[PDB]
Ligand binder design. Structure first.
Ligand SMILES: *[C@@H]1O[C@H](CO)[C@@H](O[C@@H]2O[C@H](CO)[C@@H](O[C@@H]3O[C@H](CO[C@H]4O[C@H](CO)[C@@H](O)[C@H](O)[C@@H]4O)[C@@H](O)[C@H](O)[C@@H]3O)[C@H](O)[C@H]2NC(C)=O)[C@H](O)[C@H]1NC(C)=O
Ligand SMILES: *[C@@H]1O[C@H](CO)[C@@H](O[C@@H]2O[C@H](CO)[C@@H](O[C@@H]3O[C@H](CO)[C@@H](O)[C@H](O)[C@@H]3O)[C@H](O)[C@H]2NC(C)=O)[C@H](O)[C@H]1NC(C)=O
Ligand SMILES: *[C@@H]1O[C@H](CO)[C@@H](O[C@@H]2O[C@H](CO)[C@@H](O[C@@H]3O[C@H](CO)[C@@H](O)[C@H](O)[C@@H]3O)[C@H](O)[C@H]2NC(C)=O)[C@H](O)[C@H]1NC(C)=O
Ligand SMILES: *[C@@H]1O[C@H](CO)[C@@H](O[C@@H]2O[C@H](CO)[C@@H](O)[C@H](O)[C@H]2NC(C)=O)[C@H](O)[C@H]1NC(C)=O
Ligand SMILES: *[C@@H]1O[C@H](CO)[C@@H](O[C@@H]2O[C@H](CO)[C@@H](O)[C@H](O)[C@H]2NC(C)=O)[C@H](O)[C@H]1NC(C)=O
Ligand SMILES: *[C@@H]1O[C@H](CO)[C@@H](O[C@@H]2O[C@H](CO)[C@@H](O)[C@H](O)[C@H]2NC(C)=O)[C@H](O)[C@H]1NC(C)=O
Ligand SMILES: *[C@@H]1O[C@H](CO)[C@@H](O)[C@H](O)[C@H]1NC(C)=O
Ligand SMILES: *[C@@H]1O[C@H](CO)[C@@H](O)[C@H](O)[C@H]1NC(C)=O
Ligand SMILES: *[C@@H]1O[C@H](CO)[C@@H](O)[C@H](O)[C@H]1NC(C)=O
Ligand SMILES: *[C@@H]1O[C@H](CO)[C@@H](O)[C@H](O)[C@H]1NC(C)=O
Ligand SMILES: *[C@@H]1O[C@H](CO)[C@@H](O)[C@H](O)[C@H]1NC(C)=O
Ligand SMILES: *[C@@H]1O[C@H](CO)[C@@H](O)[C@H](O)[C@H]1NC(C)=O
Lengths: 142, 443, 142, 142, 443, 439
C-alpha cells in the first residue's frame, strides 16, 4: 500500500506514516542491489562506466535525502518518532482554518502548497524551541 | 489555540528529475538483455490511488530524454569494442553485379579492391558486393568508387554475434521516487488525469526505431487518439495512436551468400558475396483494405480537432535526407528504407493489396549524428519480417481555403518513445510535513 | 573477543553488543585513514577506475545496510538503544522453550536458525505496536 | 552564521549549536546538489570519470563521517540531542582546571586542543557507562 | 508470559558474497595496486565453541581473486607499447654464436621497420625463439609471428616488475573472514577451530600449471583434496607438508637490442648470445622427489585402498600450457617437459638429480584467452630461479583393472588461488535479532 | 562536582586535505568542466577572536589545482585530432612575403600526406615557426617535426577556448575555507583576522614562467614572500600593489591553410603571408618598470640591509621555458626575451623581442605534446603584471643578485592562494559541567 490512501484524508493517515517511512530507503534498495548483483552484472557496471557512476549517484542521493530527513527530525527533538508535537504555536498567517473545516475535510497533496513559503519559518522556530528546551533541561539538572 | 505537529512518512510527492534504471526478463548476446541486467518483478504490483488527480505533460517528460540518452549511450558502448573498418577506404573497381545467369541486379555493384592482410607488407585483391546507397563515385566517367563514410569519419562494424532484436524494457525508479500512470483511456496529454495509479516499473517498452510509422507499440484502448504539443501550430508533430494495428510484411527476398575477409590481427570484415536465384527486390507488402479503413478512422478523428467540412489531404514527405523522407526501420538486423508513396497519396471529402519498394543501406548515420557511422553487417540468407503498425507520425501544412495537408515528416526518435511514455510521470516522495493540532509538548 | 561467545551462550554474549555496532563504521573510517595516509594510493586506485567503482559500491552498500538496521530500529521505537523491550507477546507457534533453555544452553547462531522464519512477523507486529503507541500518546497530550 | 561562535568563549556557542549542527551534512550537500543538478553537472561530466569518482567519494565520506559521529552519540546514550549529560564523573587530572573558566574566558578551540589527547579515554568511559545503564534498565523492567 | 525484546549488535552471521580489497605491506604492479597498508599486528581472535562449515570449491573468494588479478595484468599493459607495426614478413635464418656454433631454438630474423618518420623504413635484425615464430608459407625463409592471425600484441613495459609479493585480502566493514585452523581439514565439511580475522595471511600470486610453487605448507601430513575422489572428472590438489627445492635456469648470457618503433615506442629483442650454448632446464633432487612421491602415494593408497596399484604417467595431451610445467621466471616464460617426472609404478612401495628440459617462450596468451597476447621483453644476462614446490595438481584415469593411474593436470589457474585459500570464508554480520523476555514495555 | 557532558555541533575544526569543488560564474573549457554557479555567495562570516597559523608553502589547494588543471588539459585534448601522419620527411626552404622578402622564421615546407583514400597521396605546403622543427642529420632541405622522436602530438581543437576565466573553489559539506585578512601577512605564521567562506574568490588559472599575470594586486604594500628568504633553493615571489601594463603582439597578418588528414580529421597550418614582415614583441613602460623595481629593491633592502647593493641580471640558462617569459596571448604561445628588463643595479618604451612556437611540452612532461593551432589575423593582447619570480644566487657580502627564474609551475598559483586554508569541521566535543545525567 505504498502511497496508499494518499487521497483519503490527512487526519487518519495513521498506518500510512509507517508505510512510506520504510519504503524510501535501503529497505527497498537492498532488493534493488540483490537484483542488480544476481546476474553478475558487475563487469557491465565496470565496462559501461557512465552507467555505473549514474547508479552510484542515484544511491548516494537517496541516502543523502534520508539523512536530510533524519537530521531535521533529530534537531527538532523528534528522533525516532513518526508523529511528534512541539510547543510552537500555529500562526494565523499559515492559512488558518478551523480543524472542523480542514481536519478530515482535506487531505495531503491538496494543502501542502497552502503552507509553502512558511516551511523555513516553521523549521527555524522548531530548532530554536528545541535548543532552548535542551538548555533549560541542562540548567534544571542541579 | 493551535500548535505545530511534525509528521514523518506523509504520502505526498512533487515533480522531480532523477536518473532511473532499466530491467528486463531473462531469456545470442542480445545487447538489451545485457545492459538491462536487472531482473524484473515476476509479479509486478499496482496500487490504485482513490480520489487522486495529477497533472501530466507528455512533452516535458524527463523519461523520453533519459530514453534518448541511455539508448545512444548503449549503442556507442556496444560498438566500442567491435571490429573497426578504418583501413577499408581505397579506390574500388566496381561493375554491375549479376546473379545466376548473368542477370543484372539493380542497386548492387561487384567491387574489387586491394586490401591488407595479417602481415602489414602483404596485400591482396578481394571482391565483394555493395549497395549503391553506400558508395559514391570518384570519377563521373570511370569506375573508381569509395564508401560514403570516407569524408566524414571512420566506421565501426557492429559485432556479428551481437543481436539487436528489441526486447521489452521495464523502467524503474530508484528508492525515494515513484512512477504515476494515467488510467484515463482518452488522455491526450498536457492536462489533469483523474484515474491514476502508482507503480515501481513501466509495462515494458520495446526500443523500436522508426521514422514515419510507430511500430510494435501499444494500442489505444478507446478510439484512435491524436496527440500534439500544439494542435493548432502546424510546426509540431502529430502522434496518432491506433486502437487496431496494421499487419505489414517486409522482405529482402534475394538469397545472398556472405563472405568474410581477415583485414587485420583478429579483425574480420563481412560482406555480401555472390548471389543466387532469380532477381528479386526488397519491398513491404501491406493489406490495402485495412490501411484504407485505418486512415478513414484517422481522418474521422482528425475532424474532432479540425472542421467537419474541412478537406483532409495526405501527401508524401516533400524531401530531405533518405532517413526522414522514407520509412526507415530495422528488419532482422538489416536496415530498410521504403518510399511510402502508396500510403500517403489521398484526399478526404465528407482482395486488393499494395507494395512499397524498399532500398537497403548498410552504412547508417544513426541518430542523425555527423560521423561515428555504423556498418550493419551482412545477413546470410533471405530476410522476412512482420510488424504491427500501431501509430503514425504526421506533420501539417495549412494556410489553405479550409483544407489541411498532412505528410509523414517526423524523424525525431523521441516522439516514438513518447507513444509509450505519455502515461507515466516521475515523482519524488516528500515524507516530511507539518500540521496544526490541539495537542502540546510536555516537559 | 570481537565475536566472542557467539557459539557459547546468549546471555554472556549479549553483554558486549557495543563492539559490533562500533566496528560497522570504525572499520570504514580506519580503512579510509589508511588511504589518506597514502594519497598516491588514492591516485592510482582512482586511475584504476574499475577498482574505484568496485569499492565505492562496497562502501555505499555498507552504509545502506547500517541505515537499514537503524531505520528499522527507529520504526520500532528502539532508536538510540542496543537493548529495548516492546509490548508484543511471544507467539508459541514458532518456539516453546522457556528462558533458561535459550539464554543459557544455546547460542545466538542457533537462535538465528531457531526463529529464522518467525522474525519478519516480529517486524510487522513491532511496526503496528509502535504506531498504535504513538497515536495513543498523541491523543493523551491534552 | 556558520562557525560564528568559534572564537567566542565556551557557553556562547550553546545557542549557536543548531547553526553548527547544519552544513556538516544536508546544509551544503543539497545546495551543491541543486547547483550541480541545474546545469546537468556530472551528467555531461560523466565522461570525466576521474572527476565523477572524486566527487562521489567526497560525498560518501561526508556521509560516513556523519554516521560515525551520530553512532558514537548513540552508543553513549542520549543521542538525537545537541546537549546531553552522562553519569561519568570528570577526571580532573586531565586538565585540573576546576574553574568557572570552563564556561568563561576561553574558547572551544582552545579547550579541544587542551584535552586533545584524552579523547579515547573519555570515549571508553562513556561506552562502558551506557552498557551498564542499558543492562540496568533491562533488569529494572524485568 | 513472554514478550519480544529486540537486540542490536548481535554476534551472528551468514554466508555472503561481497567485494574485498587487497593490501600488501622498482615499479612492481602488486605493490602499486594493493597500495593499502596491511596491519603489522593482525589480531586473530579464537571463537570458542564456534563451528563453521567450509567448502573451498564453492569459495567465492577465488573468483574475486581471479578477476582482480586478470584486471591487474590487463591494466598494467594498458599504457605499454603496441607491437602491431612489427607484424611484417620476416627474412630468417639459423642464428649463430661464437665460432659459428649453430644455436638450437633461435632464429636470426630481419625485417623492414618504419623509423620515426613514417615515410622511411630501415632493415633491422633480431634473434627470436623459434617457438614464437611460424613459417609464413610452405617452406620459405619467410616467417611470421604466431600472434599475427589472432590479435594485436602489447609488450609488457620493461620498467615494470611482475615479481609476486604476498597479498593480504581484507574485508570491508560489516564482513569478517572466518579462518579454519583444523590442520587435517580436507577442504569440505564442518570445522571446529574457527577464528575471526580481518585480512588473509598473505598469498603470493604465483601462476603455475602442474606443480604448485612458493606456497604454504600443510601443518599436518600431506592432504589430498577433491570434491569427488570417485569422480575422476574433477582435479585433485596435493598440499604437501614438506617442500622440494627446484632450480631452474636459462643459462646462456644474452644481450638486448633496442629498436625504435615510433616516436615513443621501443621494441626490445635479443641482439646476440655470446656462446658456449646449452639448453634452458630445471633441476630436482632425486631422493627428495622419490620420497615425496612415495608419501603422496601413501595418501592415495589411504583414499583408494591398500591393495590397489598406483601409477604415474606424463600428461595425456594438449598444448604447452597444460602438457608442460609453465611458469614465469624473472619475466621470462618457461615451459618444462615433466615427462621425466610422473613415470612410476607403486605396488607395496640414487644420489643423482632429475633434469627437466625447458622450452622458453616470449609470446604468451595469458589465462588462455583468445587474443590479448603479451610479449615478454628480453632480459640481458643469465636467468636463474630457485623455488619451493609445495603441492601438485593431478588428474585420475578410468582404466580400473585394480590400477589408478595419475597424470599432471592444470589448465584452470583458479585451482592455484584456491589451493591457498581453502581455510578462509567470508561472512556478513547480521547485528539484528529478537528474543523473548519476562517483561514488556511500560507504555 | 564536575561531570562529563557531550556536545554535538561544537564550532571547532582541524587541518585537513580534501577534493574541493570547482565552479565558475565556440566554447570555453573551464566553463564546461567547472559548470556550476558561483553567484549566490555574497557573504562571509568574520570570526571574532580567532587566531590560525597559515603556511602558504604547504597548501594542498595549490597541489589540487595543479592536478586539476593538468587533468582538464588532458581531457580536453583527448578527443581532438591526432597529427601522427604529419611526422614525415619535409622538403623545406625560406619563406617570403611581399616582393620576395625572406622571413626570419617561417620555414616553408612541403610534405607528402595520405588523403581520404589510403591508396592516394598528395603534396601539401605549410609554413612553420623554426622552433618546431629540427634538421635531419644536417642535410640541406631535410627536416622533421621536433616531436617525432618523443611522442605523438595532439592538435588542440580550434573550437575550444583556453582563455582562463575566474575560478572559485568551494568546500564540500563538513569543510570550510579560512581566509586571512591581515593585509600585511607574509604567507606564513599566525593570522588573527580570519573569515570563513564556503568558496574562494575568482582566481584565473593563468600560466606563466617568470612574470606573474592577471592576478590580484597584492595588498596596499608590496610583499615579498619566501619559505626562507635566506636560502637560495627557495623561489622568491614578489607581489606588487600596482599593476604594470604590458602590450604583447604578433603583428604578422597571415592566411591559415586547412588540410584534410583523414575521415573527420583536420589539420591547420599557417598559409600565405598577407602583410609585411614584422617581429613579434611586447611593449613595457620603461619608467613604470623603473619605479616598480625601485620599490621592490627597497622592500628587498628591508630584508637584506639598508646599505646593501642589489642588482638584477638575466636568467642564466635552461630551456626557453626556464629563461624566456612564456605565456599565451590570443590563443598563440609567446616566449619573450626578458634580458632587456632584468639588467640593473641599485645602490640606495622597452621592447622585448618574442619568439613564437606552436608545439609545447607543457609542464615539462615527456610526451603528451600539444600542437597549438594557427590563428588567422594579427594578435594583440594586454596584460597586468602583478608580481615577479626571483631566484637568489648569494655570493659576496653586501651583494644581492636576483634573476627572473621561472620557478615551479605551482608558484604561479601559490601567489594567489596564500590567503586560503582548508579545515575539517569537528562537530563533537566534551566538557565538564555541574550537571549529571538523571537516574
Ligand atoms: C515486432 O515484433 C515482431 C514479433 O511480434 C518481430 O518479428 C520477429 O522478428 C525477429 C527478428 O527477425 C524474428 O526472429 C527470428 O529468429 C530466428 C532465430 O535465428 C537464430 O539463428 C540465426 C542463425 O543465423 C541467427 O542469425 C539469429 O540471430 C538467431 O540467433 C531466425 O532464424 C529467423 O529468421 C527470425 O529472424 C521473429 O521470428 C519475428 N517474429 C515472428 C512472429 O515472425 C518484429 O521484428 C518486430 N518489429 C521490429 C521493427 O523490430
Ligand atoms: C618464487 O618464485 C620466483 C620465480 O617464480 C622466485 O624468484 C626469485 O626470487 C628471488 C628472491 O630473493 C630473487 O632474488 C633477487 O632478484 C632480484 C631481481 O632483480 C635481483 O636483483 C637480486 O640480486 C636477487 O637475485 C630472484 O631474482 C627471483 N628470480 C628472478 C629470475 O628474478 C622466488 O625465489 C620464489 N620464492 C619466493 C619466496 O618468492
Ligand atoms: C588578462 O585579462 C585581459 C582582459 O580580460 C585579457 O584580454 C583578453 O584577451 C583575449 C585573448 O586575446 C581576448 O579574446 C579575444 O577576443 C577577440 C574578439 O572577440 C577574438 O577575436 C579573439 O579570438 C579572442 O577571443 C579578450 O577579448 C581580451 N579581453 C580584454 C577585455 O582585453 C588578457 O588576455 C588576459 N591575459 C591573461 C594573462 O590571462
Ligand atoms: C593462426 O595461426 C596459428 C599458427 O600459424 C594456427 O595454429 C595452428 O593450428 C593448427 C590446428 O590444427 C595446428 O595443427 C598447428 O600446429 C597450429 N600451428 C601452426 C604451425 O599453424 C591457428 O590455427 C591459426 N588460426 C587463426 C584463426 O588464424
Ligand atoms: C578583518 O576582516 C574583516 C572582514 O571579515 C574586515 O572587514 C572589512 O573591512 C573592509 C574595509 O574596507 C570593508 O570594506 C569590508 O566590507 C569589511 N568586511 C566585513 C565582512 O567586515 C576588516 O577590515 C579586517 N581587519 C583587519 C585587521 O584586517
Ligand atoms: C611556400 O612554398 C609553396 C611551394 O612552392 C608556394 O606555393 C606555390 O609555389 C609555386 C612555385 O613553386 C608558385 O608558382 C605558386 O604561385 C605558389 N602558390 C602559393 C600557395 O602562393 C608558397 O607560395 C610558398 N609560400 C611562401 C610564403 O613563400
Ligand atoms: C474516496 O472518496 C470516497 C467518497 O465517498 C470515500 O468513500 C473513500 O473512502 C475515499 N477513498 C479513500 C482511499 O479514502
Ligand atoms: C476503434 O475505434 C473506432 C471508433 O469509431 C471503433 O469503430 C472501432 O470498433 C474500434 N476498434 C477496436 C478494435 O477497438
Ligand atoms: C564454551 O563452553 C564452555 C563449556 O564448559 C564454557 O565454559 C565456555 O565459557 C564457553 N565459551 C565461551 C566463550 O563462553
Ligand atoms: C632474405 O634476403 C636475402 C638477401 O639476398 C635473399 O637472398 C633471401 O632470398 C631473402 N629471404 C627471404 C625469405 O625473403
Ligand atoms: C635562407 O636565407 C639565408 C640568408 O642568409 C641563407 O643563408 C639560407 O641558406 C637560405 N635558406 C634557404 C632554404 O633558402
Ligand atoms: C609611460 O607612462 C607615462 C606616465 O606618465 C607616460 O607619460 C609615457 O608616455 C608612457 N610611455 C610608454 C612607454 O608608453
Amino acid at each position: 500500500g505504498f502511497l496508499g490512501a494518499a487521497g483519503s484524508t490527512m487526519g487518519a493517515a495513521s498506518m500510512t506514516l509507517t508505510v512510506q517511512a520504510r519504503n524510501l530507503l535501503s529497505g527497498i534498495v537492498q532488493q534493488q542491489s540483490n537484483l542488480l548483483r544476481a546476474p553478475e552484472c558487475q563487469q557491465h557496471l565496470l565496462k559501461d562506466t557512465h552507467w555505473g557512476i549514474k547508479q552510484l549517484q542515484a544511491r548516494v542521493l537517496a541516502v543523502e535525502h534520508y539523512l536530510r530527513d533524519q537530521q531535521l527530525l533529530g534537531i527538532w527533538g523528534c528522533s525516532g518518532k513518526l508523529i511528534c508535537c512541539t510547543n510552537v504555536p500555529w500562526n494565523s498567517s499559515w492559512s488558518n482554518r478551523n480543524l472542523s473545516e480542514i481536519w478530515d475535510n482535506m487531505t495531503w497533496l491538496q494543502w501542502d502548497k497552502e503552507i509553502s513559503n512558511y516551511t523555513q519559518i516553521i523549521y527555524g522556530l522548531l530548532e530554536e524551541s528545541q535548543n532552548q528546551q535542551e538548555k533549560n533541561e541542562q540548567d534544571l539538572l542541579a | 489555540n493551535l500548535w505545530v505537529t511534525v509528521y514523518y512518512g506523509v504520502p505526498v510527492w512533487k515533480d522531480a528529475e532523477t536518473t532511473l534504471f532499466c530491467a528486463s526478463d531473462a531469456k545470442k548476446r542480445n545487447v538489451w538483455a545485457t545492459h538491462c541486467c536487472v531482473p524484473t518483478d515476476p509479479n509486478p504490483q499496482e496500487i490504485h490511488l482513490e480520489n487522486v488527480t495529477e497533472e501530466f505533460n507528455m512533452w516535458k517528460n524527463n523519461m523520453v530524454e533519459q530514453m534518448h540518452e541511455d539508448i545512444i549511450s548503449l549503442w556507442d558502448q556496444s560498438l566500442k569494442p567491435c571490429v573497426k573498418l578504418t583501413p577499408l577506404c581505397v579506390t574500388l573497381n566496381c561493375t554491375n553485379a549479376t546473379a545466376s545467369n548473368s542477370s543484372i541486379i539493380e542497386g548492387m555493384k561487384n567491387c574489387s579492391f586491394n586490401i591488407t592482410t595479417e602481415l602489414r607488407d602483404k596485400r591482396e585483391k578481394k571482391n565483394a558486393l555493395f549497395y549503391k546507397l553506400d558508395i559514391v563515385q570518384l570519377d563521373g566517367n570511370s569506375s573508381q568508387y569509395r564508401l560514403i563514410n570516407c569524408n566524414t569519419s571512420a566506421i565501426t562494424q557492429a559485432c556479428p554475434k551481437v543481436s539487436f532484436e528489441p526486447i521489452p524494457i521495464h523502467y524503474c525508479a530508484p528508492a525515494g521516487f515513484a512512477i504515476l500512470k494515467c488510467n484515463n483511456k482518452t488522455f491526450t496529454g498536457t492536462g489533469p488525469c483523474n484515474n491514476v495509479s502508482t507503480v515501481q516499473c513501466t509495462h515494458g517498452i520495446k526500443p523500436v526505431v522508426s521514422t514515419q510509422l510507430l511500430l510494435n507499440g501499444s494500442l489505444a484502448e478507446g478510439e484512435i487518439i491524436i496527440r500534439s504539443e500544439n494542435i493548432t501550430n502546424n510546426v509540431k508533430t502529430i502522434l496518432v495512436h491506433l486502437n487496431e494495428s496494421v499487419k505489414i510484411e517486409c522482405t529482402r527476398p534475394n538469397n545472398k551468400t556472405v563472405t568474410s575477409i581477415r583485414i587485420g590481427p583478429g579483425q574480420w570484415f563481412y560482406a555480401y558475396g555472390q548471389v543466387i536465384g532469380d532477381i528479386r527486390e526488397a519491398y513491404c507488402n501491406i493489406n490495402e483494405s485495412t490501411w484504407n479503413e485505418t486512415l478513414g478512422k484517422v481522418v474521422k478523428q482528425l475532424r474532432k480537432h479540425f472542421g467537419n467540412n474541412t478537406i483532409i489531404r495526405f501527401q508524401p514527405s516533400s524531401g530531405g535526407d533518405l532517413e526522414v523522407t522514407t520509412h526507415s526501420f530495422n528488419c532482422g538486423g538489416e536496415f530498410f528504407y521504403c518510399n511510402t508513396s502508396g500510403l500517403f497519396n489521398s484526399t478526404w471529402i465528407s482482395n486488393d493489396s499494395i507494395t512499397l519498394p524498399c532500398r537497403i543501406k548498410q552504412i547508417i548515420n544513426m541518430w542523425q549524428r555527423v560521423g561515428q557511422a555504423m556498418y550493419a553487417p551482412p545477413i546470410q540468407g533471405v530476410i522476412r519480417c512482420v510488424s504491427n503498425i500501431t501509430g503514425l507520425i504526421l506533420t501539417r501544412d495549412g494556410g489553405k481555403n479550409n483544407t489541411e495537408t498532412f505528410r509523414p515528416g517526423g524523424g525525431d526518435m523521441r516522439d516514438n518513445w513518447r507513444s509509450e511514455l505519455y502515461k507515466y510521470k516521475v515523482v519524488k516522495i516528500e515524507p516530511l510535513g507539518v500540521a496544526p493540532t490541539r495537542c502540546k509538548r510536555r516537559v
